[PDB]
PDB file of C-alpha atoms in Angstrom:
ATOM      1  CA  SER A 246      87.679  55.750  55.398  1.00  0.00           C
ATOM      2  CA  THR A 247      89.735  55.904  58.564  1.00  0.00           C
ATOM      3  CA  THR A 248      89.541  59.327  60.215  1.00  0.00           C
ATOM      4  CA  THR A 249      90.769  60.870  63.489  1.00  0.00           C
ATOM      5  CA  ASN A 250      87.827  59.149  65.225  1.00  0.00           C
ATOM      6  CA  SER A 251      89.983  56.022  65.420  1.00  0.00           C
ATOM      7  CA  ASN A 252      93.029  57.762  66.909  1.00  0.00           C
ATOM      8  CA  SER A 253      92.913  57.651  70.711  1.00  0.00           C
ATOM      9  CA  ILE A 254      95.139  60.265  72.336  1.00  0.00           C
ATOM     10  CA  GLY A 255      97.186  58.952  75.257  1.00  0.00           C
ATOM     11  CA  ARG A 256      98.348  62.255  76.714  1.00  0.00           C
ATOM     12  CA  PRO A 257      98.072  65.943  75.676  1.00  0.00           C
ATOM     13  CA  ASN A 258     101.091  68.153  75.105  1.00  0.00           C
ATOM     14  CA  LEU A 259     101.341  70.468  78.034  1.00  0.00           C
ATOM     15  CA  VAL A 260     102.993  73.090  75.781  1.00  0.00           C
ATOM     16  CA  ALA A 261     103.286  75.672  78.607  1.00  0.00           C
ATOM     17  CA  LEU A 262     102.936  76.141  82.377  1.00  0.00           C
ATOM     18  CA  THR A 263     102.314  79.338  84.366  1.00  0.00           C
ATOM     19  CA  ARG A 264     102.374  80.486  87.985  1.00  0.00           C
ATOM     20  CA  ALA A 265     100.003  83.247  89.097  1.00  0.00           C
ATOM     21  CA  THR A 266     102.500  85.343  91.039  1.00  0.00           C
ATOM     22  CA  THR A 267     102.638  88.955  92.210  1.00  0.00           C
ATOM     23  CA  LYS A 268     105.455  91.118  90.940  1.00  0.00           C
ATOM     24  CA  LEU A 269     107.182  91.823  94.201  1.00  0.00           C
ATOM     25  CA  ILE A 270     108.373  95.329  94.683  1.00  0.00           C
ATOM     26  CA  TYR A 271     109.696  96.301  98.071  1.00  0.00           C
ATOM     27  CA  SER A 272     113.349  96.491  97.271  1.00  0.00           C
ATOM     28  CA  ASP A 273     112.704  99.850  95.618  1.00  0.00           C
ATOM     29  CA  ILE A 274     110.464 101.023  98.476  1.00  0.00           C
ATOM     30  CA  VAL A 275     112.348 100.272 101.689  1.00  0.00           C
ATOM     31  CA  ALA A 276     115.755 101.338 102.781  1.00  0.00           C
ATOM     32  CA  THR A 277     117.603  98.150 103.474  1.00  0.00           C
ATOM     33  CA  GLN A 278     120.306  97.038 105.894  1.00  0.00           C
ATOM     34  CA  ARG A 279     120.664  93.775 107.797  1.00  0.00           C
ATOM     35  CA  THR A 280     119.911  93.233 111.500  1.00  0.00           C
ATOM     36  CA  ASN A 281     122.277  91.090 113.599  1.00  0.00           C
ATOM     37  CA  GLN A 282     120.521  91.448 116.967  1.00  0.00           C
ATOM     38  CA  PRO A 283     116.945  90.617 118.200  1.00  0.00           C
ATOM     39  CA  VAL A 284     116.502  94.398 118.630  1.00  0.00           C
ATOM     40  CA  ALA A 285     117.484  97.209 116.240  1.00  0.00           C
ATOM     41  CA  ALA A 286     117.863 100.893 117.178  1.00  0.00           C
ATOM     42  CA  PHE A 287     118.297 103.720 114.694  1.00  0.00           C
ATOM     43  CA  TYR A 288     119.754 107.158 115.414  1.00  0.00           C
ATOM     44  CA  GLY A 289     117.994 110.430 114.710  1.00  0.00           C
TER      45      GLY A 289
ATOM     46  CA  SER B 245     110.625  75.394 126.954  1.00  0.00           C
ATOM     47  CA  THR B 246     113.256  78.066 126.493  1.00  0.00           C
ATOM     48  CA  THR B 247     111.836  80.882 124.382  1.00  0.00           C
ATOM     49  CA  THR B 248     112.500  84.583 123.770  1.00  0.00           C
ATOM     50  CA  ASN B 249     110.918  85.176 127.197  1.00  0.00           C
ATOM     51  CA  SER B 250     114.093  83.792 128.847  1.00  0.00           C
ATOM     52  CA  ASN B 251     116.638  85.501 126.610  1.00  0.00           C
ATOM     53  CA  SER B 252     117.843  89.111 126.762  1.00  0.00           C
ATOM     54  CA  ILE B 253     119.704  91.639 124.620  1.00  0.00           C
ATOM     55  CA  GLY B 254     122.869  93.387 125.795  1.00  0.00           C
ATOM     56  CA  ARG B 255     122.763  96.115 123.154  1.00  0.00           C
ATOM     57  CA  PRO B 256     120.600  96.608 120.009  1.00  0.00           C
ATOM     58  CA  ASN B 257     121.978  96.732 116.490  1.00  0.00           C
ATOM     59  CA  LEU B 258     122.180 100.321 115.471  1.00  0.00           C
ATOM     60  CA  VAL B 259     121.647  99.286 111.803  1.00  0.00           C
ATOM     61  CA  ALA B 260     121.666 102.897 110.537  1.00  0.00           C
ATOM     62  CA  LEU B 261     122.319 106.487 111.568  1.00  0.00           C
ATOM     63  CA  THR B 262     121.049 109.650 109.944  1.00  0.00           C
ATOM     64  CA  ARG B 263     121.284 113.396 109.887  1.00  0.00           C
ATOM     65  CA  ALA B 264     118.569 115.503 108.315  1.00  0.00           C
ATOM     66  CA  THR B 265     120.265 118.573 106.910  1.00  0.00           C
ATOM     67  CA  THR B 266     119.331 121.291 104.447  1.00  0.00           C
ATOM     68  CA  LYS B 267     120.618 120.643 100.965  1.00  0.00           C
ATOM     69  CA  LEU B 268     122.690 123.745 100.666  1.00  0.00           C
ATOM     70  CA  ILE B 269     122.294 125.386  97.380  1.00  0.00           C
ATOM     71  CA  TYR B 270     123.974 128.719  97.218  1.00  0.00           C
ATOM     72  CA  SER B 271     126.956 127.780  95.153  1.00  0.00           C
ATOM     73  CA  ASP B 272     124.722 127.621  92.080  1.00  0.00           C
ATOM     74  CA  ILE B 273     122.870 130.809  93.044  1.00  0.00           C
ATOM     75  CA  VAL B 274     125.614 133.285  93.831  1.00  0.00           C
ATOM     76  CA  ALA B 275     128.577 134.160  91.735  1.00  0.00           C
ATOM     77  CA  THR B 276     131.467 133.650  94.005  1.00  0.00           C
ATOM     78  CA  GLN B 277     134.921 135.104  94.200  1.00  0.00           C
ATOM     79  CA  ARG B 278     137.135 135.340  97.282  1.00  0.00           C
ATOM     80  CA  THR B 279     138.244 138.644  98.791  1.00  0.00           C
ATOM     81  CA  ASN B 280     141.721 138.979 100.375  1.00  0.00           C
ATOM     82  CA  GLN B 281     141.005 142.260 102.189  1.00  0.00           C
ATOM     83  CA  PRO B 282     138.491 143.431 104.888  1.00  0.00           C
ATOM     84  CA  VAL B 283     136.760 145.427 102.112  1.00  0.00           C
ATOM     85  CA  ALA B 284     135.713 144.496  98.550  1.00  0.00           C
ATOM     86  CA  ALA B 285     134.988 147.007  95.767  1.00  0.00           C
ATOM     87  CA  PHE B 286     133.453 145.880  92.509  1.00  0.00           C
ATOM     88  CA  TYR B 287     133.720 147.715  89.179  1.00  0.00           C
ATOM     89  CA  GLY B 288     130.618 148.795  87.198  1.00  0.00           C
TER      90      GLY B 288
END
């Protein structure tokens, strides 16, 4: 009458891992260009 | 301790230039046909 009571479990199966991260949306919000100087200046 | 307080900028990066202008929609509003005389006279 051996049951699972006699079966020690060394390690669990992780199965899955998840990171709690924000969906980042700014690419669709801000006009984008790169700056190549410490100061930028736009023309109106 | 050289920091941004010692450095200077010759000219800024323009990055972008704009012009706010009216979207001109008349082409889709008025039937258009060129005249080759100082006076036009349409037929009803």
